[PDB]
């Protein structure tokens, strides 16, 4: 899940505060690529 990737510990600062991956990045379930977008009669679609 995004939540688990979010709480990945990148480093711990001198004062003891934690830098998590969600502190340096937005974490979402997104496409491997964003090249192909398909429509069927105008409405959203995928296909083979």
């Amino acid at each position: 899940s995004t939540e688990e990737f979010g709480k990945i510990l990148l480093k711990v600062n001198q004062d003891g505060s934690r830098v998590l991956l969600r502190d340096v990045a937005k974490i979402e379930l997104g496409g491997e690529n964003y090249d192909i977008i398909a429509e069927f009669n105008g409405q959203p679609a995928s296909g083979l």
Binding site: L9, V12, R18
Partner: protein, 48 residues
């Protein structure tokens, strides 16, 4: 059927705090308890 198994959680913060790499932790556990195929030697003309 499902059986009892021993879940161990590595504390990433404690490892980083003591300056212990996760590679060294995971190798030590894996090598010791699971075994590790390192490389080949030659026993009386046969690679093993």
């Amino acid at each position: 059927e499902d059986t009892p198994q021993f879940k161990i959680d590595i504390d990433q913060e404690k490892a980083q705090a003591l300056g212990v790499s996760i590679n060294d932790i995971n190798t030590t556990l894996g090598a010791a308890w699971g075994g590790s195929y390192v490389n080949d030697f030659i026993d009386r003309g046969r690679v093993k």
